[PDB]
Design a protein around this ligand. Structure first.
Ligand SMILES: Cn1nc(N2CCCC2)nc1CCc1nc2ccc3ccccc3n2n1
Ligand SMILES: [Mg+2]
Ligand SMILES: [Zn+2]
Length: 313
């Protein structure tokens, strides 16, 4: 009840910044997450015994793959924590509660393969969910973990608040299917420019939370250069293993997933930063001005990739 979570002085200050890295000590990641819920939500959002058991079942259901693992989950929650702390008064008590849980759960039980490879392997998850295949599985794993005994952190919600919070978490997790991102940003662009964008229109909030989820999920491109470079090794380790598997089925992988195109990595980051990342944080800054540091850090890292191509590092 009277039990606060604290962090050492360096973390206590650095955690409020957008570019914070959660570090290599795994056993401190849960404390970091609880710290962020208490400061963001209040010490009275979740029963502490239930929250701690939910976090450890969630951790237990992430796999030891090079990128889509428990570390990514907590990194994506921290970015959402920073967005929520710099835009305090734009979000409901239910939105704050639901969006940090969404971020922790958003890649539950990922296997290190794209929706694409599941469909070409004919995996049973691709017969049960024809589109946003892994993302419907992730929400489904979240609901399974919430119905374990002693795990329902939303116990104290009213019956109707309960339904609204599971609806926020479901839309939030679907939105991390980058195939849905392109359409969502275009529509957000035109609504803010024609002045029609209205935050009381529920379906408009949906789109804005959609874009926030894309931004948090890409936040690896908004870190200090050596965090960004070293996370890119992990991202390619999965893509190239998927490439290897595509070839086993007798299929040319796209160049992104072909380890024979190691040389072309710098140029492939350029495309990603210009087609996806810059547009994402550009639109997000327009809609939510205090997120500007995500835009500025993305641009700095783009300039670091240009530097790699010119042999300056
Ligand atoms: C288009 N394209 N072509 C290539 N290659 C072709 C030839 C050799 C490289 N690579 C890419 C982009 C790769 C990529 N996809 C993601 C998805 C999420 C993400 C989040 C944080 C940081 C980086 C991230 N990246 N990075
Ligand atoms: Mg995902
Ligand atoms: Zn993710």
């Amino acid at each position: 009840g009277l039990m606060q979570f604290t962090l050492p002085v360096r973390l206590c200050k650095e955690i409020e910044l957008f570019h914070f890295d959660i570090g290599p000590f795994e056993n401190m990641w849960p404390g970091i997450f609880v710290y962020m819920v208490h400061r963001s939500c209040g010490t009275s959002c979740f029963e502490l015994e239930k929250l701690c058991r939910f976090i450890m079942s969630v951790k237990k259901n992430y796999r030891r793959v090079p990128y889509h693992n428990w570390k990514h989950a907590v990194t994506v929650a921290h970015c959402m924590y920073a967005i929520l702390q710099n835009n305090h008064t734009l979000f409901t008590d239910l939105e704050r509660k639901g969006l940090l849980i969404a971020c922790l759960c958003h890649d539950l039980d990922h296997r290190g393969f794209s929706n694409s490879y599941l469909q070409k392997f004919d995996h049973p998850l691709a017969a049960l969910y024809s589109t946003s295949t892994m993302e419907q599985h992730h929400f489904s794993q979240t609901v399974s973990i919430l119905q374990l005994e002693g795990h329902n952190i939303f116990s104290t919600l009213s019956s109707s608040e309960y339904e609204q919070v599971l609806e926020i978490i479901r839309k939030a997790i679907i939105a991390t299917d980058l195939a849905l991102y392109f359409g969502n940003r275009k529509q957000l662009e035109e609504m803010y420019q024609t002045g029609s964008l209205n935050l009381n229109n529920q379906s408009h909030r949906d789109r804005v939370i959609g874009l926030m989820m894309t931004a948090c999920d890409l936040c690896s491109v908004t870190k200090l250069w050596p965090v960004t470079k070293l996370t890119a090794n992990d991202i390619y380790a999965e893509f190239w293993a998927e490439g290897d598997e595509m070839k086993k089925l007798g299929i040319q992988p796209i160049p992104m997933m072909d380890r024979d195109k190691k040389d072309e990595v710098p140029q492939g980051q350029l495309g990603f930063y210009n087609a996806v990342a810059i547009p994402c944080y550009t639109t997000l800054t327009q809609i939510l001005p205090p997120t500007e540091p995500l835009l500025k850090a993305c641009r700095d890292n783009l300039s670091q990739w240009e530097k790699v191509i010119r042999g300056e590092e």
